[PDB]
């Protein structure tokens, strides 16, 4: 009874952009990962610190679900120890990551015949992100020595750039929906685990 609400995460009407990813807490419920794993709709179902068939037995304190939309060719960057624009300035995973990553193609939903420009990513940032850190600042990025006072120009850029999702794009530049599950087992009594 009181099954975990996994339908409100995977089947959400709209997703978030990668620079402003969505985080959801799962607790006080029973989780059935068999339906998630046996589905044939997922292009990527990869996980590292747990055995994919043993999720139904392990019991954790709580679960985190982080969801966003990225480019098809950047799914390889959502993994421990990776480097790139997404891994360095948008979404960083720890090297001792536990949990796992699910990703599927959503070209029919996130592409528009004239081009979809509602999805953004950060391109300019002074330093790398700490694991599980979010940054939604939209201040003008200074790339030179002369400080601009909030007006865009030659060496002062808006740090967010839009994807160009379009239905005729080749596989590699088509949108992909990504959900990352993180399992926390703390000193508190375990709460999330299946039958």
């Amino acid at each position, epitope marked *: 009874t009181n099954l975990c609400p996994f339908g409100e995460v995977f089947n959400a009407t709209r997703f978030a952009s990668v620079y402003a990813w969505n985080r959801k807490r799962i607790s006080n419920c029973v989780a059935d990962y068999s339906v998630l794993y046996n589905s044939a709709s997922f292009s990527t179902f990869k996980c590292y610190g747990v055995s994919p068939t043993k999720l139904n037995d392990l019991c954790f304190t709580n679960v985190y679900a982080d969801s966003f939309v990225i480019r098809g060719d950047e799914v390889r960057q959502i993994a421990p120890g990776q480097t790139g624009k997404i891994a*360095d*300035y948008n979404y960083k995973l720890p090297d001792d990551f536990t949990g796992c990553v699910i990703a599927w193609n959503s070209n029919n939903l996130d592409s528009k015949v004239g081009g979809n420009y509602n999805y953004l990513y950060r391109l*300019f*940032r002074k*330093s*790398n992100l700490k694991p599980f850190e979010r940054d939604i600042s939209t201040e003008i990025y200074q*790339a030179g020595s002369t400080p601009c006072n909030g007006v865009e120009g*030659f060496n002062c850029y808006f740090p967010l750039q839009s994807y160009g999702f379009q239905p*005729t*794009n080749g596989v590699g530049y088509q949108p992909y929906r990504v959900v990352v599950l993180s399992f926390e087992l703390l000193h508190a009594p375990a709460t999330v685990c299946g039958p």
Partner: antibody
Amino acid sequence: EVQLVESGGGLVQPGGSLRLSCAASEITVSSNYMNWVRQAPGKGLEWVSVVYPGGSTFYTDSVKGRFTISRDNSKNTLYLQMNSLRAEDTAVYYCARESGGFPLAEGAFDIWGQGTMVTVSS
Amino acid sequence: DIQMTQSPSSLSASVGDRVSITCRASQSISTHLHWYQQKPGKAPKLLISAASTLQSGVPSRFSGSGSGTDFTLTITSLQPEDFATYYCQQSYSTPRGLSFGGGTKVEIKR
């Protein structure tokens, strides 16, 4: 006064080592995507290496394990250390800035240096 | 491993003529293509970005078009100083796939 100046090219024996420097003016090396690009005599352009604003570095397959790209914030300089040089590395090397321009040309090199010549021969 | 082919290899034209150069990719690259101009003994100069956007400080006679797997650069009136070599460069392959084209050279007709 946006400017890039290269230095350090020359003639080395096969298996030798070299160090190239790129001094920048009016642009901050630690804040931009900085690339090294080489051109062989009479041939086309070829990408060599890149360093990110946050510190990540990438190399092409031909030079991986032999070249190292570095920065210096006190002197505002870029460095390329080349080891185990071979005759195929004889070229003109350019220090370039990526993703600039007034309309923000992403993925394009808008500022280039003069280039320096590296000859590897015995 | 995307390779770009430029046509033609060389092109002869006179002053005041209209010139077109084509760049073709082995697979669709959307609009991630840029056009550079290089004169002998000098570094390349960026002319066109995103296959359609003119850069500031570039004469308005230069124009670019195309998408998918075919792209074109057009010069309407050819001034005497436009005799150089032109390159097309793609920025589609994400991590380490940056590559240039072969290049097209323009010379004076007689």
